[PDB]
């Protein structure tokens, strides 16, 4: 059998593509010219997969859809206090307004407009970096994420580089209030080379996943860039992505994304989906048309929305067996808060002490609460509490002849966990111990220690 | 023992109580004169747990913490295209422009201004509905989610009602404009009263749980609200919430939330967790100087933050077992896009056809990833790809000797599934049986079917 997400992917190519409405970015002639008729599109999953259709395997240069990346390399270069010291976070228009730096702040709103990005390469890789090593600095974070050596397309970087202006202009102004250090010739030619980096659809996708994973190469599995920094990127997407329109989109469609004009648009939903989509045409404010149409349909079609939980949630709890005096409780899944909240609730679940617990609400006051608390499997299928359930269960009928001594924790099914998870689930070994329970942690791969 | 979060939800307590700047609510004399000394904090869970600290038992008006539930109430009422017509979906400062309502929308920019909620409560019903049916429709919406019949505080609402001049200046205009029918005196006293609606730090984590879990109730497990209706809610809290400071809360914090006057503060992270946090003083923009700065912590300690992903992904599959010449296929936990979707690399990762796959990507390109592939159990475990590899496994080896002829799911571990989750996991099916493979569900209690 065939994979249907492709089939998918091929399905709203041809229905979307049944018209193109916009125009190719004109203040760029080698753009302008550019032809119009292709449409692809792709999705790389964070386990390792990869679906496309359309023109997917078609390069075009990144632009704007870099600055995420270089805002994150400048992030692990130079640490979060220096970059913020330069770029900041609130949402706008590309429409540059000077009041934006007088501000005690002295700093573009944030890294997803071009004052911003300005600045972000100016921090690239050191205060005594030359002019090249922050080039293919850009060049080197990009070209990792999408797992093989990008190039710069120089055709267009000096197409642009001769009507440059507009970026000299930001550049100028933000060395007078001090957030460019060197020549804004200089500045302004690394961000156009940057910007000229040539990506295919699958390239972002791929690129898109390692930020939707919190930083993890899916094709790999190696740590590409540290969870807390391409959380702050994922962030700046999702809210300046869009400039003033982020609101509605958020709402409308709720994937965190950035297009270039030159037909890209790049997404990363957190947990879920790397996108890439291509499509020339632009609409009235700049993005490709058709590749936020799709982005769109994407979200409606799967619910695939920044607000649509899917949470690990009991789950992490594969199963809890009171075989008999001592109880087998297996774990599995990415564990983090989600599923090390859940652990606590089973360990806690069991009778090893006094049970004098906190309802934390009046039986009285809720019958409907209480009511509804009588069916434990029944509350925990319709909320999604996985076999967390399992731990009243064993603690009941069965503790009624018998008290728990020893409690295994399985941690075999496991993937992987957090520090979060890590020091929740040790604190609450450390409490089973204390009730004078023995533990024993069956953990074949070394997983639970910081 | 102890479950561990109630005791860090105290010791946070403690920890920022130790001091409380910032002023009460000067603008309405009952307010000012509430008492400074108080600060508590409550989570709800998805699955129905609550844990508090502090003075989370104390009930206080919710002021604006009730803007996002009236504005629920008012799509159910309603729908999206009548409600959309009058309130907007862009962020903004509450400090109120003309200028926003000369759009050819002619319509406040959103839910979570007073401008906004003035419109919502005028939609409340019905065009025909009267004064008090709209005021328990919105007291009825916040009742029905707390879990108890809730009441006005009548006492601030004569306060207040004796000094609204603002929201009355903000009623006449939105008149003018059309977006408001009835009189300008009359949707100020109902929004008025609307935030005179009494709650605990509890009763908004569990209000913000319902929103959180897509509109289940955690405490019995029946639908409040649709999903799709919850998810527009939640988006406007992110995107508007914070007004103008939004973008810089999204990623300092990450969390779903509106502060109100009287120092509540709701919170709703998907998938996660409903939060209330109470705390009088307001700093300097407004909100509760605790209460966000208790956001804040919960935040950076647990990583409960929009951006760090807590999916389910592979996990959907528990296991995969060739045992001969059938295999059998179990899943669990929510199912949803992200569980479908690995399903159907579980089923299609099984050869029952020509195996003539479309990698995705080119070994010769790309070295890394065919090694990294080489290892599939190494590669599942770093990204979290749960028991789906197992698939590739029964294909593997086993079917060196004898074909696959029967696939039994068994649904038995799966808590529910949208849809979405329906639909594809079907369509898998149906290509199954088209590789002439017999396929049979197992589902104990009915749940596939749409
Ligand atoms: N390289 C362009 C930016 C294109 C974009 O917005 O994607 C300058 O200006
Ligand atoms: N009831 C107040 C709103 C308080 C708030 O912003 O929470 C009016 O104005």
Redesign the interface.
């Given at each position: 059998?065939?994979?249907?997400?492709?089939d998918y992917l091929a399905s709203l190519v041809t229905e979307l593509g049944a018209v193109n409405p916009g125009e190719t970015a004109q203040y760029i002639p080698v753009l302008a010219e550019a032809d119009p008729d292709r449409f692809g599109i792709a999705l790389a999953?964070?386990?390792?997969?990869?679906?496309?259709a359309g023109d997917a395997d078609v390069e075009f240069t990144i632009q704007s859809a870099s600055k995420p990346f270089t805002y994150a390399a400048a992030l692990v270069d130079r640490g979060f206090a220096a970059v913020d010291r330069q770029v900041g976070?609130?949402?706008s228009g590309e429409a540059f307004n000077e009041l934006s730096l007088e501000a005690e702040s002295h700093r573009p709103d944030?890294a997803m407009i071009n004052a911003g990005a300005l600045a972000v390469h100016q921090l690239l890789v050191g205060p005594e970096a030359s002019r090249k090593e922050r080039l293919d600095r850009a060049v080197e974070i990009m070209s990792l994420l999408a797992?093989?050596r990008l190039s710069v397309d120089w055709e267009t970087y000096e197409s642009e580089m001769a009507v440059s202006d507009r970026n000299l202009s930001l550049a100028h102004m933000l060395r007078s209030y001090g957030v460019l250090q060197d020549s804004a010739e200089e500045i302004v030619a690394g961000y156009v080379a940057q910007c000229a980096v040539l990506v295919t659809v699958?390239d972002l996708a791929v690129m898109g996943a390692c930020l939707?994973?919190?930083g993890?190469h899916?094709?790999?599995?190696?740590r590409m860039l540290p969870?807390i920094v391409?959380?702050?990127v994922?962030?700046?997407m999702?809210?300046?992505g869009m400039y003033?329109?982020?609101?509605?989109w958020?709402?409308?469609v709720?994937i965190?994304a950035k297009s270039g004009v030159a037909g890209g648009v790049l997404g990363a939903l957190?947990?879920?989906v790397g996108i890439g989509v291509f499509s020339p045409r632009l609409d009235e404010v700049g993005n490709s048309a058709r590749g936020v149409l799709a982005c769109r349909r994407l979200s409606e079609?799967?619910?695939?929305?920044?607000?649509?939980?899917?949470?690990?949630?009991?789950?992490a709890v594969?199963f809890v067996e009171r075989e008999g005096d001592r109880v087998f409780l297996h774990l599995?899944?990415?564990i983090?808060?989600?599923g090390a909240?859940?652990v606590?609730?089973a360990?806690?679940d069991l009778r090893?002490?006094a049970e004098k617990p906190?309802t934390?609400?009046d039986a009285a006051?809720?019958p409907?609460?209480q009511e509804?608390?009588a069916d434990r499997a029944?509350?925990?299928?319709?909320?999604?509490?996985?076999?967390?359930h399992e731990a009243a269960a064993a603690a009941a009928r069965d503790e009624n002849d018998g008290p728990i001594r020893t409690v295994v924790l399985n941690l075999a099914?496991v993937?992987?966990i957090?520090d979060?998870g890590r020091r929740?689930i040790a604190?609450?070994v450390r409490?089973?111990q204390?009730?004078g329970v023995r533990v024993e942690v069956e953990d074949p791969?070394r997983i639970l220690p910081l």
């Open positions: 059998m065939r994979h249907p997400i492709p999953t964070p386990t390792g997969r990869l679906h496309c976070l609130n949402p944030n797992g093989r699958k939707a994973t919190g993890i899916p094709m790999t599995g190696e969870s391409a959380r702050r994922v962030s700046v999702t809210s300046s003033d329109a982020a609101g509605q958020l709402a409308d709720g965190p957190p947990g879920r079609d799967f619910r695939l929305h920044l607000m649509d939980g899917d949470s690990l949630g009991g789950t594969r599995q899944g990415v983090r808060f989600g909240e859940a606590l609730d360990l806690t090893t002490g906190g934390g609400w006051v809720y409907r609460w509804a608390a029944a509350l925990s299928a319709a909320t999604g509490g996985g076999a967390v099914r993937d992987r957090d979060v929740l604190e609450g409490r089973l204390a009730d791969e």
